Design a protein around this ligand. Structure first.
Ligand SMILES: Nc1ncnc2c1ncn2[C@@H]1O[C@H](CSCC[C@H](N)C(=O)O)[C@@H](O)[C@H]1O
Lengths: 265, 265
């Protein structure tokens, strides 16, 4: 009769909360999805061992089209968990899953966990200054999507930071790197020429948030576009004008060039 | 000689991540602050029992003025942890503390935890649609803060949602309720008359996120301004333009008036 939405956190199997782990261990059935994001610092095997339950992995279609026939039936007379990377209900379409639960006469509860939305705070950029967020998608065939470029434009114009998620094809396990994201953005700039993303734009790269040894780098596109940020996933941020305190953190912690202390403040 | 910034999460001691607990259990000294937020479902004793350590609680002054004198000295020869509610670097000025650690020659690591910033996902509002965030501060003497009103205005103009952190004065054990925030906003509207926040404005209230039964309510200010949302902490959210599914969730899950289902596009 109960469905638990449980977040797995940012990087490895230890990123789940004590509450989430204990509730998971008490569930009769455990489902999970790894198409929205992938726990880069662990494996399905390590997660299964930690929880001590077999985990029924679900594809995007399994969730979006058949959540009510794969998960809810069992949740009708059993305690069931639905695990997701990060914090539950962050993925755009997940909140609607609680409506499906209600319609099926199933109670649902949310067990939160760390999300990149809040973890980006490790970049030293003030959370209140982030504006609209967006995802950088790979162009394909005749389709060249660029809305993420306009998001950056509108935020920066108002002195706000722009959090950019990078493309991911979970099944094929192919991640977009910050480097690719930058090259793509320079290409969009050459097209729209809005003076939004250029070689002189200051950017911040966060790789493997959640691990004890994450890669936090800041600098100008001209110097970071070919830098090695390590293994994915990578998150790209285009900060708005900086607070001197944000700039000092980027210089002292993220190795940003002292130049930002005068140019981007 | 390491310093760990470890978040404790949204509501109770079980909101800490497994990673954070295991690392906290093995630290030589443990410090913490409980003035940046309120963890309504736990006590200092419960947290201490969980990590099996005595916790040296610090005031805002101990931290902001004496962090390098109270915490860092020990972090130079021991493994020290500094615990905080939610995520340690979200809507706090704790990030600058890492710069202090660096200057004292102390390495620091950050262990994230669920934060109110991402927990907004439980309101059904698409998290990528949130714009600039703000804090509703208690007026003091002849000083009446109003900047948060302009933030709402700016976001609303762009069709973006506005997350409003609410004031807190731990030493006075004062925690601003969503009701008090609504009253202050109506007063600012009376002054600026921008048509930004009125009795007909749709708002969302999230109280005690992290608990199994948080209060999630959506409706017009005129109807919610006097509604009892339970014990603090609370956050107030002023949505921008709603997607059909955001409206459906507010109605089905947050008990919003069915009339908001009809969205003006
Ligand atoms: N569990 C909770 N439920 C509702 N609001 C919360 C909350 N925890 C924090 N807040 C909101 O945030 C304010 C503190 S701001 C500090 C936030 C913290 N670092 C985090 O990551 O969550 C509170 O005054 C309140 O308005």
């Amino acid at each position: 009769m109960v469905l638990y939405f449980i977040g797995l956190g940012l990087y490895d199997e230890r990123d789940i909360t004590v509450k989430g782990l204990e509730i998971a261990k008490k569930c009769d059935y455990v489902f999970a999805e790894f198409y929205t994001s992938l726990m880069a610092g662990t494996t399905l095997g390590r997660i299964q061992k930690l929880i001590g339950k077999e985990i029924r992995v679900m594809s995007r279609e399994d969730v979006e089209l058949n959540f009510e026939n794969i998960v809810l039936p069992l949740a009708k007379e059993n305690d069931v968990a639905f695990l997701t990377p990060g914090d539950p209900l962050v993925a755009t379409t997940h909140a609607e899953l609680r409506i499906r639960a209600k319609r099926a006469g199933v109670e649902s509860y949310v067990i939160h966990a760390p999300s990149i939305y809040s973890a980006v705070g490790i970049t030293g950029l003030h959370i209140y200054k982030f504006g609209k967020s967006a995802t950088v998608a790979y162009p394909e065939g005749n389709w060249f999507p660029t809305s993420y470029y306009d998001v950056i434009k509108e935020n920066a114009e108002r002195g706000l930071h722009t959090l950019l998620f990078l493309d991911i094809k979970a099944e094929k396990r192919m991640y977009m790197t910050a480097n690719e994201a930058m090259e793509l953005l320079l290409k969009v700039e050459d097209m729209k020429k809005g003076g939004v993303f250029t070689d002189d734009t200051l950017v911040v790269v966060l790789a493997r948030a959640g691990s004890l040894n994450p890669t936090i780098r800041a600098g100008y596109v001209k110097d970071l576009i070919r830098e090695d940020f390590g293994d994915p996933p990578h998150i790209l941020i285009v900060p708005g004008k900086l607070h001197i305190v944000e700039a000092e953190y980027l210089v002292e912690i993220a190795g940003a060039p002292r130049e930002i202390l005068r140019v981007n403040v």
